[PDB]
Amino acid sequence: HPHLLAERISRLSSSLEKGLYERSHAIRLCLLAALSGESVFLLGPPGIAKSLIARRLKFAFQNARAFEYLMTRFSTPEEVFGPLSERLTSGYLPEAEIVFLDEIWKAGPAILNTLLTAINERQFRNGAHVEKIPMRLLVAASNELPEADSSLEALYDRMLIRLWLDKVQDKANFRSMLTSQQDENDNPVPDALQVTDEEYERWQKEIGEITLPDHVFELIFMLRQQLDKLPDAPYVSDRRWKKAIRLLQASAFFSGRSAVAPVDLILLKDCLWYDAQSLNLIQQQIDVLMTGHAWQQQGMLTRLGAIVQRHLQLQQQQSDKTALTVIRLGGIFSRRQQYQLPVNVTASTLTLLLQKPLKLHDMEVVHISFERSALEQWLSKGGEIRGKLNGIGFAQKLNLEVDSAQHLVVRDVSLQGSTLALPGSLPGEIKQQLEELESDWRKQHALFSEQQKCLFIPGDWLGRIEASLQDVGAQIRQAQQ
Amino acid sequence: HPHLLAERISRLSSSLEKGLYERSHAIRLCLLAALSGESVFLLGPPGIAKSLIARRLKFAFQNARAFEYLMTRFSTPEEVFGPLSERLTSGYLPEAEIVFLDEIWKAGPAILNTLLTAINERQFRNGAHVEKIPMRLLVAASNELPEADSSLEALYDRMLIRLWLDKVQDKANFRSMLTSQQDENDNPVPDALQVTDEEYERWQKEIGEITLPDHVFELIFMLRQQLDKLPDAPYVSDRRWKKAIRLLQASAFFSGRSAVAPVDLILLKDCLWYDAQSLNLIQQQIDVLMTGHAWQQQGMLTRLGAIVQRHLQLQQQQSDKTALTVIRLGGIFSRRQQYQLPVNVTASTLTLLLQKPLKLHDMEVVHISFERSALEQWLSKGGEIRGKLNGIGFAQKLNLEVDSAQHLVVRDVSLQGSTLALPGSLPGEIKQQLEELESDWRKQHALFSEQQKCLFIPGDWLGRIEASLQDVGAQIRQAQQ
Numbered sequence: 001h002p003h004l005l006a007e008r009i010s011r012l013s014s015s016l017e018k019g020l021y022e023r024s025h026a027i028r029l030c031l032l033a034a035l036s037g038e039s040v041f042l043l044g045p046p047g048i049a050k051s052l053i054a055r056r057l058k059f060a061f062q063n064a065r066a067f068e069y070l071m072t073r074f075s076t077p078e079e080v081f082g083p084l085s086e087r088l089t090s091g092y093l094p095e096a097e098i099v100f101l102d103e104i105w106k107a108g109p110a111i112l113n114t115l116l117t118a119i120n121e122r123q124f125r126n127g128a129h130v131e132k133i134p135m136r137l138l139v140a141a142s143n144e145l146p147e148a149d150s151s152l153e154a155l156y157d158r159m160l161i162r163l164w165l166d167k168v169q170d171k172a173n174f175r176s177m178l179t180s181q182q183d184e185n186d187n188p189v190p191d192a193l194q195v196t197d198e199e200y201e202r203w204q205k206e207i208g209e210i211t212l213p214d215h216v217f218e219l220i221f222m223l224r225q226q227l228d229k230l231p232d233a234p235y236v237s238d239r240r241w242k243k244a245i246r247l248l249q250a251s252a253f254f255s256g257r258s259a260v261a262p263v264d265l266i267l268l269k270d271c272l273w274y275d276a277q278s279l280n281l282i283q284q285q286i287d288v289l290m291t292g293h294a295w296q297q298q299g300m301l302t303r304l305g306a307i308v309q310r311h312l313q314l315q316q317q318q319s320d321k322t323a324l325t326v327i328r329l330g331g332i333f334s335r336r337q338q339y340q341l342p343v344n345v346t347a348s349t350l351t352l353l354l355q356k357p358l359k360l361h362d363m364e365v366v367h368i369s370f371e372r373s374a375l376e377q378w379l380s381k382g383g384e385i386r387g388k389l390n391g392i393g394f395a396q397k398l399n400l401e402v403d404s405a406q407h408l409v410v411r412d413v414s415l416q417g418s419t420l421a422l423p424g425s426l427p428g429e430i431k432q433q434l435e436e437l438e439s440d441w442r443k444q445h446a447l448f449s450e451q452q453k454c455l456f457i458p459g460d461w462l463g464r465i466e467a468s469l470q471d472v473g474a475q476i477r478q479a480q481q
Numbered sequence: 482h483p484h485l486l487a488e489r490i491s492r493l494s495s496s497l498e499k500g501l502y503e504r505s506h507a508i509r510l511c512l513l514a515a516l517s518g519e520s521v522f523l524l525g526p527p528g529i530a531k532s533l534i535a536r537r538l539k540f541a542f543q544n545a546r547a548f549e550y551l552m553t554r555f556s557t558p559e560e561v562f563g564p565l566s567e568r569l570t571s572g573y574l575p576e577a578e579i580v581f582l583d584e585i586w587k588a589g590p591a592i593l594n595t596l597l598t599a600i601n602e603r604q605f606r607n608g609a610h611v612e613k614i615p616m617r618l619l620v621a622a623s624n625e626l627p628e629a630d631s632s633l634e635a636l637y638d639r640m641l642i643r644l645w646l647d648k649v650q651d652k653a654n655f656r657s658m659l660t661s662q663q664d665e666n667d668n669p670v671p672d673a674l675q676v677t678d679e680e681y682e683r684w685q686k687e688i689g690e691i692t693l694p695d696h697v698f699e700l701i702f703m704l705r706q707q708l709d710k711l712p713d714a715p716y717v718s719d720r721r722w723k724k725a726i727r728l729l730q731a732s733a734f735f736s737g738r739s740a741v742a743p744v745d746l747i748l749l750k751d752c753l754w755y756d757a758q759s760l761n762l763i764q765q766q767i768d769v770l771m772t773g774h775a776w777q778q779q780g781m782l783t784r785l786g787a788i789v790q791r792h793l794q795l796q797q798q799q800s801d802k803t804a805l806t807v808i809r810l811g812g813i814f815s816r817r818q819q820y821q822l823p824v825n826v827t828a829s830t831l832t833l834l835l836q837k838p839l840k841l842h843d844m845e846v847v848h849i850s851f852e853r854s855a856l857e858q859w860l861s862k863g864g865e866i867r868g869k870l871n872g873i874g875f876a877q878k879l880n881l882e883v884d885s886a887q888h889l890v891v892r893d894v895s896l897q898g899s900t901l902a903l904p905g906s907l908p909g910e911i912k913q914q915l916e917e918l919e920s921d922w923r924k925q926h927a928l929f930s931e932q933q934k935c936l937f938i939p940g941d942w943l944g945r946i947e948a949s950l951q952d953v954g955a956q957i958r959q960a961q962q
């Protein structure tokens with residue numbers, strides 16, 4: 001039953017995207033906050049699809065009412081909630097579900113005071129007796145930012161999601177967007193994908209029952225302590241941490257999961273900043289946290305580097321056991337041609353060890369790697385050979401010659417000998433530590449290879465999380481060759 | 482059938498012009514917006530007849546209702562849409578077609594909030610259920626301009642056409658305007674030029690079916706990115722780009738065309754600016770765009786350079802046939818002055834070839850161009866000469882001296898000689914590639930000589946487009962001499 005819920009949500013948000021290109025993040029975040037009882041805020045220039053998203057999410061329900069209002073500097077509370085006779089609230093806000101308030105940073109003093117009571121209590125001071133407000137989604141958009149010392153900051157600190165919308169930049173997505181024929185006032189949502197009023201009241205209780213894994217708490221508490229030490233980092237109140245969990249628990253609820261997923265921390269990039277200065281700071285700390293401490297990205301880099309350094313140190317010590325013998329070949333040719341090892345070596349960019357280290361190019365080296373396509377030509381036609389040092393840099397020229405006992409002597413600027421050799425086919429101490437680190441990478445990759453189908457995750461984040469996991473796997477499989 | 486539609490529209494706008502002088506540009510823009518479902522804004526001092534054009538476009542239909550209301554500082558929404566009893570909207574706005582609202586920049590906050598929902602959704606609330614509004618033309622005149630940080634900018638950013646009206650300036654037009662015997666309250670439009678209600682509903686669906694050519698999309702995306710890089714350029718929202726396509730597609734629909742024509746971009750000069758400061762900036766960027774990349778004006782300039790670069794490559798190979806003999810000018814001077822060829826060369830930025838190429842400024846060169854105004858000064862007064870390389874970059878300094886054989890030796894960093902030469906007075910490969918580019922100019926000129934009969938295009942723009950096409954054609958005919 002929980003597995004079939006992720007399929008119904010994927011089909012509901014698909015019809016909402018039809019008509020607004022490059023706006024999937026501004027629609028999927030509003031649908032999750034509407035089904036969980038959270039708010040959302042938008043910011044940007046007027047004309048980047050900020051009022052249509054408030055009139056589009058109402059079609060996904062069966063008993064929703066829209067309310068598009070524009071707050072002015074001379075607005076009165078009697079024109080927002082309804083004029084009194086006790087207040088005629090026929091189709092306004094106390095009985096509505098999805099309301100829209102544009103330019104909220106300029107309303108009257110009594111208007112903002114009544115909006116704070118309808119959020120923490122979902123009630124209203126309608127005359128004498130109070131009544132509940134079935135508000136499911138609270139969206140607000142504007143253009144500029146409020147003052148640093150004013151009463152408008154009380155509502156900004158209470159809103160959870162802070163969406164950062166902007167104009168389009170891609171050229172391919174602007175072709176069909178410029179000449180679109182889809183109407184924005186029809187009903188693109190089918191009647192089979194709209195939830196009922198009974199399912200909404202039941203889902204509000206099962207969100208709080210999501211367990212909190214111990215591995216997830218290690219990432220939430222670490223991000224809180226990191227922002228406290230940075231002076232340029234914005235301050236986050238205790239209310240924001242409690243309201244953010246309800247958003248992450250609701251994301252895993254509609255994705256076929258029962259616990260808080262570690263990948264759900266990506267949505268925290270729109271719930272910590274407050275201005276344009278802290279926008280690039282929150283997205284930078286999360287990108288390092290998700291690619292450094294989430295699936296133990298940096299935790300394995302500091303462990304694999306010690307294994308490779310220990311492996312290369314043991315290979316340059318036991319080089320006297322395995323040498324390098326070059327076999328001859330028949331045929332009729334002037335220059336004495338040489339043939340490499342047959343099935344013993346098959347790689348193209350193999351590495352060659354050495355006994356006594358030398359100072360080549362005014363620097364030390366512990367291993368020299370050659371090219372298989374370039375080694376076969378020098379051993380047959382002759383000439384000069386080019387090879388890099390320490391696996392980095394360009395293929396510099398070396399003074400490599402042939403030995404009387406069929407070896408590879410490397411000469412330097414002091415006419416010193418250095419017989420090359422190939423590494424044998426892994427010590428027991430290195431293999432014991434390599435299998436334990438490789439098994440930990442498969443366990444972390446198994447968790448990511450099951451929760452990546454989350455609909456509430458942007459597409460640009462999958463290009464960096466997967467690239468950070470494949471980079472470690474491509475390096476750990478090279479030392480075991 | 483589509484060809485006969487342009488003749489009926491030309492006769493409809495001609496009857497509406499009778500009675501108003503120097504107002505042809507305002508009537509043509511309001512007629513196209515009325516048949517496409519757009520809006521229009523006027524601005525001017527009281528007395529230039531701003532409310533007469535609203536009562537004039539209603540005679541072009543058969544079932545149209547007028548509404549002329551004066552918005553004041555104490556206006557109420559009940560006196561505009563209709564007083565409630567459920568609202569008595571008998572002949573007002575929810576059931577009207579062409580409405581007029583003068584001095585819209587002073588209404589109450591409840592009036593502006595109801596006008597925003599009657600444009601995007603074409604509906605209006607009536608207590609419980611709602612109803613559609615058969616609005617065909619939205620016009621509103623004023624006198625002053627709104628504030629920079631106010632709530633009145635929400636409606637201004639949604640309007641498309643921004644007309645700039647002014648008092649009369651011509652003396653001949655003012656004499657016949659005061660003594661005009663034509664009545665402004667009669668029906669000058671014949672019964673044969675009035676469209677029916679069935680033809681209007683069918684035309685609103687065929688406008689969205691106009692195809693968007695690939696060459697037209699290159700002009701819209703380039704103009705969008707050009708205004709973003711200029712700080713003084715006004716910001717254009719994404720809503721303005723989408724609403725502008727409906728205006729351009731409607732212009733080509735009533736002109737005998739089935740696709741979007743590049744000449745229709747001239748109407749964008751009154752749909753981007755917002756004040757008197759940005760009025761001269763929008764008309765300047767479009768004038769360069771319509772005379773640069775519209776009919777491939779500059780597009781053939783960057784392609785002709787590749788032919789000249791290939792032509793100069795073959796001329797420098799056979800430069801040993803015709804050298805460059807410099808004659809000695811008459812008069813006894815201290816330094817041996819030199820003089821170029823007389824009538825044989827008259828260009829200001831002529832090019833000079835060379836035999837053996839040299840590595841000047843760490844790069845190769847095949848032709849060096851010198852300025853005629855700067856060559857006569859260096860060869861007569863001495864000093865240092867400055868010349869660019871490959872026709873690009875800045876005029877760098879070169880080590881040019883005089884030769885004993887009356888030539889020009891170019892010295893470099895290795896003290897190497899190089900005798901310069903000039904191209905003489907056409908290969909088969911260059912002629913084949915030149916006829917392909919020259920044929921493209923005739924194809925672009927044939928398109929302009931067929932769609933210039935558009936009535937919605939002003940006459941002053943045709944004087945600069947033809948002058949820009951002849952400049953490109955006059956340059957391509959010079960290399961073939």
Ligand SMILES: Nc1ncnc2c1ncn2[C@@H]1O[C@H](COP(=O)(O)OP(=O)(O)O)[C@@H](O)[C@H]1O
Nearest residue numbers: 019020021046047048049050051052184719720
């Ligand atoms: N980025 C966008 N992609 C697709 N459509 C857009 C975009 N921005 C605006 N629109 C279209 O413009 C219309 C009006 O948008 P509007 O409500 O004025 O936006 P805002 O509320 O941000 O000013 C909408 O119907 C929407 O379809």
